[PDB]
Design a protein around this ligand. Structure first.
Ligand SMILES: [Ca+2]
Ligand SMILES: [Ca+2]
Ligand SMILES: [Ca+2]
Ligand SMILES: [Ca+2]
Ligand SMILES: [Ca+2]
Ligand SMILES: [Ca+2]
Lengths: 8, 114, 114, 114, 114, 114, 114, 7, 7, 8, 7, 8
């Protein structure tokens, strides 16, 4: 699967 | 003390035409696509539910781009039933991975789909 | 899908009087007492900061009452730098644990204090 | 007593854009596409040439269809520099695999491309 | 050729209220307190008698003061049923240790009492 | 692309007067003396057929003269059922080896005869 | 409670003619033939003194007659520097064994002479 | 250290 | 990579 | 348990 | 080497 | 067993 990083 | 979010996915594995099929369910037990969005630092825990009769065990989490910085670390339980990812969510972007499992039928490693 | 909290502790180990001292710091670098409270299902991540020259590595997390249900699972990184605990918070109560570490000076395992 | 063929491939791994690139060379040092055809029972030996500073080591060979019967077994050397496949060539067809490697920079496993 | 003394203790483990209880017996089969006095260089051998149904195995011997010099080395059998300590009896004093065991019910390590 | 020869021997193990007896059969199923001549670079694969009830598994291949250059490498399957030798056939001469196996009855390693 | 004898041997390994030579010394540093006689239950401890640059480590103790009852168990230290044998001396007779060592030059196991 | 569960 | 069996 | 060393 | 048991 | 190398 995938992991999507949306940083703060 | 700073804290983050802990996400959970169950990795259900069955066979179809003799080969593994990975189906992900969420903390509600509902089928999901399996992908996780990380919006702040935290962890993602994957629990293996092996329904194959092939004696699957996690041995790690594999990446074609292991140096991309999206996931910081992988931890694994001694029984191969859990893997956890540490994601500090500093590097933006997406990474794709495949679970890596041993099996008791042969000495080939098993990969989830690319 | 429900999420939990991912808590973090840095496990700083240094020598005093020839023996280890475990000093816990939080995500802000502040010294803390080290105990963690869990109020919903989640994870606790412990990062080793070996300040010694003894080559410490985590090999697991040990419990005198390992079947008490407070902690469900332990995962460990391949490099011995991280352990993570899975706490589904379904059993109320308190448990005490000791980190278990190998060292490169001798073949004795190292324990944090009881 | 019947004998088979022992084929060989060198698995050269180097970084480009911060990530691995797998380049296969044959016994004459010539770049090759990397796939191997088996027409009788035999072996295929893969030698790791880690050109990176990432401390790569083979930990196994992974298959999305591990029960297809194309490859019977995988063996690995204690130093992680060799993997060998046993192919009795009794099942016709094609299988795809990805090398699985540990690294010394992080705790993620490395995969060659799907 | 200099020689020493070989001492023996059986580590009997049962459960009480679901948690381990360690009871030591000596080479006569008699219950003993479990502590050993070393009056010259030698060995101490501990044999596990797991009566818990939890699949206990030794994985080592843990010390809060692992550098105190009282015990020189720990050796372990491949089946987890024996640990042996090497004690050259040069450093006077007392050390306290806890056995460290894996179990087959969960991925927590088991410790004997502090 | 240069290639070599892949040779195969089955390592059949039984007991006689309670102790192991190694009988080798070739790729035709015929009893053979077990020795292999290597006339060009290649591999030799040994398949364990444990008929002892002692839970034998290969853990490696042992040599009294491990630096003689006759065998280049040993690879082992994760289930202990296969060992493969890599022999580049550059150094002429003969080497003698003993299979090394674990067993499930005790913690002694098993060796085939010198 | 009855005690036994703890005997000791230093296993000195050096190269001559490119191959190992095993020379045994006793607790007084004196060369000895290496065999040990047991007249009551006890232990024998073997300490590795690798004088080579080959990175030797014990991985076990091997027996062509592992079920003969002369030696009951083998324990090994995590660093590969010690093996200890448990000999309850309940079966009379003689057994022969060979040390089994890994090395860092190649993937062949090293054996002391038969 | 300790872990305190408050369900 | 791939392996192609032609029996 | 404990180990008590009394050296010679 | 060898081990000799004399019980 | 033994292995006998006859190089080319
Ligand atoms: Ca199906
Ligand atoms: Ca440090
Ligand atoms: Ca290199
Ligand atoms: Ca009870
Ligand atoms: Ca028989
Ligand atoms: Ca040395």
């Amino acid at each position: 699967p995938a992991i999507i990083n949306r940083p703060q | 003390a700073p804290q983050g979010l802990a996400q959970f996915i169950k990795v259900n594995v069955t066979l179809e035409n003799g080969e593994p099929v990975f189906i992900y369910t969420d903390a509600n037990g509902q089928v999901c696509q399996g992908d996780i969005t990380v919006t702040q630092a935290g962890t993602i825990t994957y629990l293996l539910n092996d329904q194959t009769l092939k004696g699957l065990k996690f041995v790690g989490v594999g990446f074609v781009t292991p140096f991309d910085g999206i996931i910081d670390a992988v931890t694994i339980s001694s029984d191969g039933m859990l893997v956890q990812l540490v994601d500090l969510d500093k590097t933006p972007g997406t990474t794709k991975f495949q679970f890596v499992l041993s099996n008791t039928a042969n000495t080939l490693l098993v990969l989830s789909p690319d």
